[PDB]
Symmetry: D2
């Protein structure tokens, strides 16, 4: 008699009137507010949010570019379920961090249509 | 943010050596053993089993009944059944309520979803 | 190998400005607009909808009561996402503006929920 | 009215009495037989299955080494097991094993993958 089970889930975000989707995540167990960016793939953290996560700004290698930026790795990111070792980077103006496609395509299910962003996931 | 979640489950049971599938449920917290009958619709209890469930035999109408709670993977509410054989029987009326039910060779495969 | 597959689907419907949800469905190959009524049980059709579906109002048996008296019917096919068969209903009062879809049908879906302004339907077929 | 649908599927394999799971696939439209290897990552094709797929043996670069013998990396454009997966990693191995091996890098791509008692269960989702 074989028996198994898991937690399954769905998250829907509706598009704000400025036309973007906003979403909360826990990153290394800190609450971070993200705006979704369809053109990015990588997570773009603000400096402020980098500090909140226990990173040092004077001691970072701002090597790569997208606009100049410091690649980084995030132990865990939770949105529905926990993801691990998530590619990111930290760069200048912007007030809010940005979530790209890479993280979102890691979901079991992920579609945008109409004004809805719909994520499906499974845990254990 | 609209956010939703639930427990999804799967039970897989191997055919018995006698050619049948048997399943052990809790009925109102009481272990019971059912044989699967694909041709049957509602449940068919043995008197023995009827008695284990706090029923009166000689004050009934085969006599139609309702079972408050039947737990196979998840808890099914208010299951149709009756009483008249050796072992009690589980029919299509219960199995169709599962998200999934299929038999394939020596496996009976049951899918369910709770919250 | 034991192989198995099916079609899975999801329908998301936004609430209407008036506060209700509305579903368009094919019933016996005809388009009917329903209002969702989460505390109804079986489908309630308007007379006009009933007539669109070829029911003869003067020959039905008005055998159920509520204080009025209504006529049970069965609908062979109702297609919302997938095709459901032998759906229960009745013809409602002469006053009914729009037909109602209740829980007896909605609970046949694999998934159904309302959250704020979205009604979410999940279904699976062959 | 937002509406969306897709194909979902489950494949189950029972452990043969030798202890191994075996499963067939279409790779670039040819049926290939595999034995599952949880130790492996990549797909390990026999030389015979490579030629059956039209690899030119004598133009492959055998730049890799495994277990001791050499092997040439390849990409399999299309592999169908339930759903189609694209661009699967493999190599073709100078070792003399008679059957090709399917590793975790392909299994892990499934939406659901689990082994318990003697059942390997795979779940997938297409359109």
């Amino acid at each position: 008699m074989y028996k198994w089970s898991t937690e399954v889930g769905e998250i829907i975000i509706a598009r704000n009137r400025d036309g973007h989707f906003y979403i909360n995540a826990f990153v290394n167990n800190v609450k971070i507010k993200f705006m979704v960016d369809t053109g990015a793939s990588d997570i773009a953290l603000t400096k402020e949010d980098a500090q909140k996560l226990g990173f040092d700004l004077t001691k970072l290698k701002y090597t790569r570019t997208y606009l100049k930026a410091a690649p980084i790795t995030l132990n865990s990111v939770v949105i529905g379920k926990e993801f691990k070792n998530i590619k990111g980077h930290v760069g200048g103006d912007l007030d809010i961090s940005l979530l790209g496609m890479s993280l979102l395509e890691r979901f079991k299910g992920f579609r945008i249509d109409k004004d809805l962003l719909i994520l499906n996931y499974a845990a254990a």
